[PDB]
Amino acid sequence: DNQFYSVEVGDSTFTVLKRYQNLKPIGSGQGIVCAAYDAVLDRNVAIKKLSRPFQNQTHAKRAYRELVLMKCVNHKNIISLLNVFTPQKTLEEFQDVYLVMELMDANLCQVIQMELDHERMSYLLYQMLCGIKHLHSAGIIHRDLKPSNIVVKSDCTLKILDFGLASFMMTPYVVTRYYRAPEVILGMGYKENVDIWSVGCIMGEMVRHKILFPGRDYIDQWNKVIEQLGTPCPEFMKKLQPTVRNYVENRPKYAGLTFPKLFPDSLFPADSEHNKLKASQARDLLSKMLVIDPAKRISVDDALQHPYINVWYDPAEVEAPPPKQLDEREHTIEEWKELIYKEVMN
Numbered sequence: 023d024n025q026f027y028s029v030e031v032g033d034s035t036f037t038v039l040k041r042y043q044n045l046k047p048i049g050s051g052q053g054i055v056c057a058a059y060d061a062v063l064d065r066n067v068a069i070k071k072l073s074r075p076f077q078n079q080t081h082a083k084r085a086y087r088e089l090v091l092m093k094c095v096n097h098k099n100i101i102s103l104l105n106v107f108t109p110q111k112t113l114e115e116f117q118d119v120y121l122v123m124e125l126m127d128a129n130l131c132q133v134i135q136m137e138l139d140h141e142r143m144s145y146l147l148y149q150m151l152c153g154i155k156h157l158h159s160a161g162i163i164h165r166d167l168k169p170s171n172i173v174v175k176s177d178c179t180l181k182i183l184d185f186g187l188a189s190f191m192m193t194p195y196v197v198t199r200y201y202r203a204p205e206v207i208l209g210m211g212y213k214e215n216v217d218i219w220s221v222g223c224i225m226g227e228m229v230r231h232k233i234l235f236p237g238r239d240y241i242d243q244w245n246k247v248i249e250q251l252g253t254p255c256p257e258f259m260k261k262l263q264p265t266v267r268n269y270v271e272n273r274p275k276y277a278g279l280t281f282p283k284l285f286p287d288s289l290f291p292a293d294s295e296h297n298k299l300k301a302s303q304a305r306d307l308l309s310k311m312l313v314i315d316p317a318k319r320i321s322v323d324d325a326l327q328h329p330y331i332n333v334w335y336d337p338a339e340v341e342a343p344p345p346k347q348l349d350e351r352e353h354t355i356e357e358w359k360e361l362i363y364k365e366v367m368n
């Protein structure tokens with residue numbers, strides 16, 4: 023009884039189970055994340071305070087889907103939830119849910135601010151591809167991969183924090199866009215390889231150390247794509263809805279730079295012969311992920327047989343047994359609060 027203590031972290035009051043102490047801020051922009059020491063298990067952990075998760079239809083959707091999927095997905099590349107809890111005793115008073123997962127050492131955003139060997143890089147990308155494969159094998163297509171959402175460990179191990187996209191909010195937080203596939207941006211329908219674009223957008227950033235296609239708006243973002251990759255072909259546009267197709271066909275045309283140009287040798291570690299051979303396969307593999315047309319873009323499995331990637335292939339790691347409930351859903355606040363609380367108490 024009374025296993026909770028309140029403590030002011032940042033601008034917030036973290037009320038948590040006694041077992042967790044010396045809490046440090048490591049997130050405001052996951053949102054109110056916090057590093058801790060779990061006295062019981064005797065390791066460090068990450069806790070996340072979902073302030074009033076039922077407060078809107080979006081939050082409630084994200085929080086519900088976060089909750090269920092983390093319970094019944096065990097892959098070494100998808101962040102492990104260890105513990106869920108609420109400080110409040112009753113559904114009437116029920117206000118906050120704290121998620122406790124295991125801790126890594128850093129953002130993928132930090133990793134991007136540094137030179138890596140092809141071994142570390144081929145490893146990270148391998149792992150991203152695994153996690154993604156599991157997700158796809160369980161019918162889950164992500165659609166929103168991003169550095170801020172992939173965490174890494176000193177020994178090169180890597181996890182993904184969210185299960186991505188499943189309408190509107192008012193925050194001081196603008197959603198990041200630079201990693202979203204053309205087929206999603208143009209709202210043309212999609213299949214699993216759609217996260218392959220997102221994977222490539224990262225690889226290229228790792229390699230360039232600058233966000234490939236930045237951009238204030240979905241309009242400005244698409245300028246910056248074709249600017250580099252070139253206007254897509256006829257076959258591609260034969261698929262975009264007449265209303266979209268119009269905007270898209272009537273656009274300053276681009277020849278677009280062939281891959282060697284976009285990614286010079288300057289950017290690659292390539293001074294030993296191993297490094298040079300490697301670089302070329304990095305670029306062959308980049309050349310295939312960064313493809314606007316999903317029709318002609320590389321599948322998830324082929325990516326894992328790619329000469330660069332497959333140096334780490336593992337049947338256990340890749341082809342793990344597939345992971346419940348319908349998840350395309352609608353409810354109101356008092357029903358969402360109902361369903362989040364049920365999922366906590368379990």
Ligand SMILES: O=C1/C(=N\O)c2c(-c3ccccc3)cccc2N1Cc1cc(F)cc2c1OCOC2
Nearest residue numbers: 048049052055068070123124125126127128129173
């Ligand atoms: O490792 C995590 C992490 N969960 O493991 C994590 C989470 C997280 C973890 C579990 C559940 C929800 C969010 C959110 C944001 C960052 C995370 N990071 C990155 C991170 C770790 C760390 F020990 C110190 C810092 C780190 O990043 C910024 O720089 C300081």
